[PDB]
């Protein structure tokens with residue numbers, strides 16, 4: 001039994017390295033493998049752990065030995081899970097470690113946009129005080145927040161919202177009834193929400209789910225929050241919406257690209273570099289989930305299986 | 308009956324101008340009077356409304372005619388209410404208009420400090436993605452927040468802290484019990500709080516309530532929030548705490564002074580220019596309190612009376 005963390009871990013403390021070596025031969029690579037290194041590392045192990053590296057169907061056809069792949073992430077959009085299924089390789093993610101961290105980040109971003117924290121701080125650094133007109137804001141209490149995706153993270157955001165005394169609406173794919181969330185279609189969500197937050201995986205179905213048309217339905221003072229992939233939005237259309245001040249602002253933890261992206265020029269966005277998840281509590285839970293995946297698989301009762 | 312708003316109103320919309328003109332002659336000065344002009348304006352009116360101008364005992368003893376002074380603010384630390392009472396001038400404030408806006412600003416500041424929003428946004432503007440280590444944060448869920456002052460605004464903060472499922476401790480002067488808040492003395496509050504937030508008026512008793520000694524008791528990762536007057540804190544001692552990184556950071560909506568204040572040079576503070584209160588909802592409620600004050604005085608049963 002060989003277990004391999006095939007690319008550079010953000011967090012992998014000594015106690016976890018020691019624990020995983022109790023289960024088998026554990027090897028960790030502190031780099032980003034090229035495609036050939038990735039195939040070789042995947043083919044030299046029985047369980048693999050991945051954080052950064054795309055695993056494509058073309059790669060999986062060249063893989064041998066590997067039986068179990070764990071994404072350290074909740075997302076698995078960079079892994080061809082269907083191709084792994086077709087090659088009898090089981091896949092698990094780490095499904096809940098970050099949900100509180102990300103839900104709190106939604107409110108961090110929402111408040112940073114609403115209160116224009118970037119401009120407000122810069123005003124004070126200029127030595128100006130008691131400046132109100134540029135910072136006229138809306139209270140979030142009693143506003144409508146619309147959650148596109150109401151799973152682990154969406155439901156955590158709803159809990160915080162519902163006790164901020166907000167109206168929570170939302171949508172999912174299965175139409176399973178989620179408690180405390182009035183479920184609507186996406187057109188109504190875009191029309192009625194004061195705040196819109198995305199909590200949905202990226203795949204072929206959800207890419208560019210926020211079309212130019214749907215974005216044009218937003219309220220004139222709406223705030224859009226994205227702690228998910230930038231590819232979920234027509235990003236060029238979002239730029240035009242913000243550039244033309246057709247909504248209040250956006251808080252974005254991901255963009256489809258960064259260098260020379262015109263959104264970087266906007267004074268009504270707040271950007272974070274994918275840091276929504278990274279709390280002390282989340283990264284520790286991430287380790288507990290990784291270890292639970294390994295133990296449960298060795299017990300022949302695997303958990304968090306992606307199917 | 309003559310009513311005068313003696314200095315520049317931040318907000319005085321059409322419906323308020325029209326309503327106050329029903330009671331008599333309404334004059335508004337869209338400027339900032341000096342002391343002599345303030346005395347003259349106050350002495351040339353029956354009811355006065357004030358927003359910016361200090362009204363000292365020396366001025367009050369020179370005033371005639373005036374019977375009722377309304378501060379548009381909740382604070383009245385710039386008005387000598389004792390001298391007003393001794394000269395048989397009634398005084399009211401506007402006591403609740405901003406409590407939701409300020410309570411939400413506490414969390415806007417808390418999250419801005421905790422998630423290092425200023426630095427995170429700057430990282431993205433430099434074109435960098437997936438930068439985690441500098442932004443390692445604590446979730447605020449299950450943390451202890453200590454509220455110095457648990458009146459109108461403090462209790463609103465306490466309600467939001469329960470929304471995030473935090474432990475709330477606090478103190479007041481009367482030691483009257485407040486439900487949902489575990490009351491402690493200030494030494495215990497400074498020692499046990501992960502987040503400290505001030506919600507206390509500025510007066511002879513509360514100035515520099517946060518001493519150098521009390522500030523030295525703070526937890527190494529504590530976050531201090533001040534939406535009240537900067538003079539509640541030994542500000543030089545606070546600078547020393549932050550400069551030496553003895554706590555995580557501070558979110559400050561006021562400073563004792565701004566020009567060349569060394570706090571402006573700190574990378575672990577988030578500053579807002581007194582903008583905590585300024586929501587659409589708050590300024591509208593401010594007008595309804597102004598009207599209720601005027602009408603109550605006209606009915607010879609004044610409300611919101613100071614002292």
Ligand SMILES: NC(=O)c1ccc[n+]([C@@H]2O[C@H](COP(=O)([O-])OP(=O)(O)OC[C@H]3O[C@@H](n4cnc5c(N)ncnc54)[C@H](OP(=O)(O)O)[C@@H]3O)[C@@H](O)[C@H]2O)c1
Nearest residue numbers: 074075149150151152153172173174199200201227276277
């Ligand atoms: N920024 C960060 O640091 C960070 C950290 C972790 C995760 N994330 C992102 O957050 C995403 C969500 O995580 P989660 O744990 O909340 O996922 P989850 O529990 O799987 O929930 C996903 C939600 O999206 C819904 N959904 C899926 N496909 C849909 C479609 N085509 N149309 C409408 N709704 C659809 C699901 O509906 P059903 O229940 O009906 O299937 C469910 O309500 C992840 O995929 C990841 O990309 C970001």
Ligand SMILES: NC(=O)c1ccc[n+]([C@@H]2O[C@H](COP(=O)([O-])OP(=O)(O)OC[C@H]3O[C@@H](n4cnc5c(N)ncnc54)[C@H](OP(=O)(O)O)[C@@H]3O)[C@@H](O)[C@H]2O)c1
Nearest residue numbers: 382456457458459460461479480481506507508534583584
């Ligand atoms: N940043 C902004 O834009 C903004 C906007 C509005 C207000 N404010 C500030 O917020 C302050 C508080 O407003 P509020 O409406 O919450 O006031 P409030 O309802 O009068 O509450 C004041 C609280 O402070 C307590 N307190 C008074 N003196 C004290 C002392 N010496 N030691 C300990 N506790 C003491 C009171 O306790 P007892 O009940 O036992 O007396 C009460 O719990 C205002 O004075 C104002 O300066 C700021």
Ligand SMILES: NC(=[NH2+])NCCC[C@@H](N)C(=O)O
Nearest residue numbers: 010051072073074075277286
């Ligand atoms: N956990 C970790 N080492 N990386 C964070 C990844 C965040 C988000 N994409 C996700 O979890 O899907």
Ligand SMILES: NC(=[NH2+])NCCC[C@@H](N)C(=O)O
Nearest residue numbers: 317358379380381382584593
């Ligand atoms: N409401 C108004 N025009 N000014 C806001 C003043 C905020 C705070 N000092 C207070 O109300 O005490």
